[PDB]
């Protein structure tokens, strides 16, 4: 019943009233994204490739998503379910592919398309390609905050939802390392009954939500320096795409 954040996460759902904390142990789907960097001139084509370690074909859909990210901002959804153009996104972005091979094509490249692009799969939890920084050979100010914490410590992050029925949507936290890698760290089902985590945060991170007050939380304890990252809350929309990202809050764990 309850909405989850990736296709495999449905298979825990229970008729008995149960609350489940889940760690899937199957082999993780690795996304190999290429090239890491490229620079083109205005009007040209940019072709970015993503190869998955196993097929994303799945009768319900092919859950390949593409995001654009500019400095100081959360990623923005461009393409969902391999080839669908997200509403509001310019038609110069198109996604294609099947099985294990996926392609983001940008043509004609425009000055505002200089950004880092990421592929992402929602078939087996959530994993991301390492990103592609696209360079080209309206005044905006965007703020965020951050803290320093010592190892072994704990922190609680929060996020607010409005303008939609929060209780209908799965929610997740994704963090971004200093090396700009995106790593999913937790998801929670729409009704709060099922929570999901990767191995890297097991026993230490807790995602929770309050559907009456429209809050999402992440509690992090036994913090390690490898938890240093910008932490984003985000909604699962159609086809397990991550379609609304809150601004990041930064966490630096240093002794």
Curated annotation (Swiss-Prot):
Glycosylation sites (chain numbering) = 8
Q: Where in the cell is it found?
A: Cell membrane
Please describe the organ and tissue distribution of this protein's expression. Spinal cord and brain.
The role this protein plays is:
Its primary physiological function is unclear. Has cytoprotective activity against internal or environmental stresses. May play a role in neuronal development and synaptic plasticity. May be required for neuronal myelin sheath maintenance. May play a role in iron uptake and iron homeostasis. Soluble oligomers are toxic to cultured neuroblastoma cells and induce apoptosis (in vitro). Association with GPC1 (via its heparan sulfate chains) targets PRNP to lipid rafts. Also provides Cu(2+) or Zn(2+) for the ascorbate-mediated GPC1 deaminase degradation of its heparan sulfate side chains.
Task: Report the sequence similarity comment from the record.
Answer: Belongs to the prion family.
Q: How does it assemble?
A: Monomer and homodimer. Has a tendency to aggregate into amyloid fibrils containing a cross-beta spine, formed by a steric zipper of superposed beta-strands. Soluble oligomers may represent an intermediate stage on the path to fibril formation. Copper binding may promote oligomerization.
Task: Give the protein's recorded name.
Answer: Major prion protein homolog
What is the taxonomic lineage of the source species? Eukaryota, Metazoa, Chordata, Craniata, Vertebrata
